[PDB]
Design a binder for these strands. Structure first.
Length: 849
DNA sequence: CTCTCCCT
């Protein structure tokens, strides 16, 4: 036990904390509390009965609207204005199977439609079933929900299907994503929505009574949500015989889902794509004749292969395959040569280069842009070269989509983002490195890492398809087919890679109280060690009690669309009147930072963040400062130049501001805020007290703590509270700085790459962790009285301050408990405000003087 | 001294 700095408080401050605490203890209605005790008192089939009565609207049909919609669909098939496409929709493969699809849906609760790119299943199946129900005179009983993984998919498909009905968005076709919607009409309608939207609507309608048809699309990508959703359908569908489910999948281990749902009817629908030829490293090197210069294992893999292909390739190319450098992206000059090769031979078309991450996208960009070779010098002026990365601006502009200037060849250097999420349509050539970056979770070390790995067979399959979009393509794989046969079928499904605290809490609102029993039902069961690690986190932040049951605060956290830790941070910000900054922090950790990382500009983007951090040693208040400055630039009509000068995405900032408005609207409806405007003066009376903002941020990121011991840009000897040595991620404002007021930090995410890095952090003060943390005891270790937090960090503290802090933590726990059970805004002159004022007083002693 | 990427 090595004691830290002295946290004792002046006697004058302790007396007034005492005057204030015992004002608070002199104190003497609830719809939320009755909702909470009802949920805990009912068993599961009481739960089923109650939610059936409460969501009954589809029990009502509208015969006159049935017959009217049936009658202008009958006639409005008789123009030629919506026909040109009915004969154009008939040219899509899915339409040939209309009646079999219709008939299979009537005879089966669940069917599966499997099909490759271009088959038309997403756009055509919803209309096939909708137009059938209208024609049978069932229009008003038909409400179809179609889920998509990505937001932009939902809007684009909705807009395109509505074009296909000669309607504007909002009649028979709509979309719903989070924070934006164009809703269809209530009945005889199709809604495209993101999977999360549907999961959140499950909290009000846990048996899906408010739709007649559920279409789950792209289940083969095995996102958490569709895996959860199929898991829940096994619970829901027994109580919903009228409900129709259509699963939709690419041809990627499709049989997993057929098996998972008994064995249900499976339709296979042929795609529409032009042929794309696949070449491997042998083939590429036999064409380019490039020469390399400047464990094995690998040799165990390659030599059997080179003996089986001995007579199909020249010996000198098979010898290059014995170098480990020859496969993947380890030699960027090799990729550069094959780019130059495609520009010389081969017809007109764009090159799509798949590389795992930012670092070597940078290297190939610089080699094409500042060429080392005469061949490169040659081709420099005839290429328009686009890096494509989530942290880069290229996808936010339209150049990378349009066709190049005449005489110029387009070269796209991208991450995995161009496999599905972003799509360039004039690509005829894919150079596939076979390498990506992926996150994996070591359950035993509690270390998250980001490592470069080989892609899966499904990845290359989809990357191959990216070339066949306008015209027959070529896919160059920078690895041998021996490496291909050592690749996994599909990536490890993300629910085995994921923190489960949010999911487990959400399942309590669906009256699924055993996460063990339920998660074991998934197609891929998560490690039960991860399930109690999630349970244990929820117990610590007190969303569950020790027996495992939902607490009143846990019910609030499950109803907030954010991870429970930051939801807790968000509610504290209401109680403590700093709503705007803390919601700024939560939305950014919950989504992403507004800053780009444009090629070559890092030293300069590093310097913008340090100026936006306003020397506050917090990545989280850096984002809030960024948002304050962004609002000022709109209020100044300077928005474009502001974003330019500071390498900011105005589209990221706009979405952060709507999440902030949404957190503010939810907290208002839950009766925690007097106003729904997250900028409201009453909600922000402390938003400029920096020590108080460190306290609320720490309350949410607790227990992720780190301690620095070090003086010198500077190097850092720092370690997390589990003893592991960490460093600030070089993208953090805190990396390399010296002279912190405090050696203590909280962080949202630690990650291993070159080193174990803290990706975001706020400098915190010991009294703040002590008040809002746990594991707090007073004692004596040498002959020095101490106060500790988490039974880890011990601070010199005199008995009078120790005792008052311990009394203070007790009434805070009583206060939080009643705000959870009886939500009200803290009234500014009442008794609860006096214990708020006690805490601000103590925290304000750490102000930078 | 470094950054796979969806989503309520």
């Amino acid at each position: 036990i090595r004691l830290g700095c002295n946290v004792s408080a002046p006697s004058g401050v302790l007396e007034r904390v005492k005057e204030l605490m015992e004002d608070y203890s002199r104190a003497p209605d609830a719809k939320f509390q009755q909702q909470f005790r009802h949920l805990l008192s009912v068993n599961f089939e009481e739960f089923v009965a109650e939610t059936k009565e409460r969501n009954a609207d589809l029990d009502w049909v509208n015969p006159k609207l049935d017959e009217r919609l049936q009658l202008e669909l009958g006639q409005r098939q008789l123009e030629e204005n919506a026909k040109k496409r009915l004969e154009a929709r008939k040219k899509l493969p899915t339409m040939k199977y209309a009646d079999d699809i219709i008939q299979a849906v009537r005879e089966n609760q669940v069917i599966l439609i499997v099909g490759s790119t271009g088959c038309g299943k997403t756009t055509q199946v919803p209309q096939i079933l909708l137009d059938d129900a209208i024609s049978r005179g069932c229009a008003s009983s038909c409400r179809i929900i179609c889920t998509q993984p990505r937001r932009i998919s939902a809007i684009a498909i909705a807009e395109w299907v509505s074009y296909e009905r000669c309607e504007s968005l909002g009649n028979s076709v709509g979309y719903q994503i989070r924070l934006e919607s164009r809703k269809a009409r209530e009945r005889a309608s199709i809604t495209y929505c993101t999977t999360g939207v549907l999961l959140q609507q499950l909290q009000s309608d846990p048996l899906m009574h408010n739709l007649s048809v559920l279409i789950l699309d792209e289940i083969h990508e095995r996102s958490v949500e569709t895996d959860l959703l199929m898991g829940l359908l096994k619970v829901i569908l027994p109580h919903r015989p009228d409900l129709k489910v259509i699963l939709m999948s690419a041809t990627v281990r499709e049989q997993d889902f057929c098996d998972y749902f008994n064995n249900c009817p499976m339709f296979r629908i042929e795609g529409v794509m032009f042929p794309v030829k696949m070449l491997y490293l042998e083939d590429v090197l036999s064409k380019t004749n490039y020469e390399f210069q400047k464990r094995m294992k690998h040799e165990a893999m390659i030599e059997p292969y080179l003996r089986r292909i001995r007579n199909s390739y020249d010996s000198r190319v098979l010898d290059k395959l014995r170098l480990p450098e020859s496969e993947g992206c380890e030699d960027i000059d090799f990729i550069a040569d094959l780019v130059y090769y495609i520009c010389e031979n081969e017809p007109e078309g764009a090159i799509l280069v798949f590389l795992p991450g930012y670092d070597k996208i940078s290297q190939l960009y610089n080699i094409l842009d500042k060429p080392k070779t005469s061949k490169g010098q040659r081709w420099r002026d005839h290429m328009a070269v686009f890096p494509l990365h989530s942290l880069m601006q290229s996808g936010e502009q339209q150049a990378v989509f349009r066709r190049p200037p005449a005489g110029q060849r387009k070269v796209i250097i991208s991450t995995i983002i161009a496999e599905t999420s972003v799509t360039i349509d004039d690509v005829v050539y894919v150079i596939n490195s076979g390498r990506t970056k992926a996150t994996n979770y070591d359950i035993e070390t509690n270390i998250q890492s980001l490592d470069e790995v080989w892609v899966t067979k499904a990845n290359t399959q989809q990357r191959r398809g990216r070339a066949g979009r306008v015209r027959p393509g070529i896919c160059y794989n920078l690895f041998s087919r021996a490496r291909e046969d050592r690749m996994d079928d599909i990536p490890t499904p993300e629910i085995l890679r994921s923190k489960l605290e949010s999911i487990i809490l959400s399942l309590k609102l669906l009256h699924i109280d055993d996460p063990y029993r339920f998660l074991q039902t998934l197609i891929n069961a998560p490690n039960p060690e991860a399930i109690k690690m999630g349970v244990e986190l929820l117990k610590r932040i007190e969303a569950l009690d020790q027996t495992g049951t939902l607490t009143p605060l846990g019910m609030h956290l499950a109803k907030l669309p954010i991870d429970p830790q930051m939801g807790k941070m968000i509610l504290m910000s209401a109680l403590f009147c700093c709503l705007d900054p803390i919601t700024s922090a939560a939305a950014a950790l919950s989504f992403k930072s507004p800053f780009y990382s444009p090629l070559g500009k890092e030293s300069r983007v590093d310097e913008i963040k340090r100026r936006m951090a306003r020397n506050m040693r917090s990545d989280h208040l850096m984002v809030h400062n960024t948002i304050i400055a962004y609002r000022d630039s709109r209020y100044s009509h300077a928005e474009r130049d502001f974003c330019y000068k500071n390498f900011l995405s105005s589209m990221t900032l706009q979405q952060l501001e709507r999440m902030k408005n949404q957190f503010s609207e939810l907290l208002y409806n839950y009766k925690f805020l007097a106003s729904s405007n997250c900028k409201d003066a009453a909600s922000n009376k402390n938003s400029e007290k920096i020590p108080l903002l460190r306290a609320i941020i720490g309350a949410g990121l607790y227990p992720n703590m780190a301690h620095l011991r070090k003086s010198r840009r500077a190097i850092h000897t720092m370690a997390t509270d589990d003893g592991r040595r960490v460093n600030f991620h070089p993208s953090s404002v805190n990396s390399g700085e010296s002279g912190f007021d405090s050696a203590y930090f909280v962080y949202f995410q630690r990650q291993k790459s070159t080193d174990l890095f803290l990706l975001d952090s706020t400098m915190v003060f010991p009294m703040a962790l002590i008040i809002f943390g746990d594991g707090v005891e007073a004692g004596v270790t040498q002959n020095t009285p101490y106060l500790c937090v988490a039974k880890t960090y011990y601070f010199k503290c005199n008995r009078e301050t120790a005792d008052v802090v311990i009394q203070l933590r007790s009434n805070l726990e009583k206060l939080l408990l009643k705000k959870a059970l009886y939500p009200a805004p803290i009234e500014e002159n009442g008794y609860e405000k006096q214990l708020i004022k006690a805490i601000e007083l103590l925290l304000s002693l750490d102000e930078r003087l």
